[PDB]
Amino acid sequence: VVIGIVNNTVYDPLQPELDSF
Amino acid sequence: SGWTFGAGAALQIPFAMQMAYRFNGIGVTQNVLYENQKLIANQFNSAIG
């Protein structure tokens, strides 16, 4: 629905913690 | 440039994006503008008519 949207990664600070855990 | 030409710098900004800031200013989340941009534009154009 959004006109002019673009693609990019959005960082999630929980993921690297669980990954390291 | 929205309100920025009043403050002095006249910073360009896409019109749909400054309208989305106007929405934040009235206490409506900016996603309401982009999700309904076609309707909002149609309403504005009709009101000017």
Ligand SMILES: *[C@@H]1O[C@H](CO)[C@@H](O[C@@H]2O[C@H](CO)[C@@H](O)[C@H](O)[C@H]2NC(C)=O)[C@H](O)[C@H]1NC(C)=O
């Ligand atoms: C942004 O990424 C999405 C994928 O997440 C792209 O969507 C695909 O686009 C192709 C055509 O280029 C289609 O064949 C696929 O079916 C689409 N996939 C989905 C899940 O919709 C999209 O094109 C990308 N946008 C830009 C500007 O690169």
Ligand SMILES: *[C@@H]1O[C@H](CO)[C@@H](O)[C@H](O)[C@H]1NC(C)=O
């Ligand atoms: C921006 O304008 C150009 C033409 O100057 C057009 O090709 C492009 O699709 C437009 N992009 C958006 C997001 O409207």
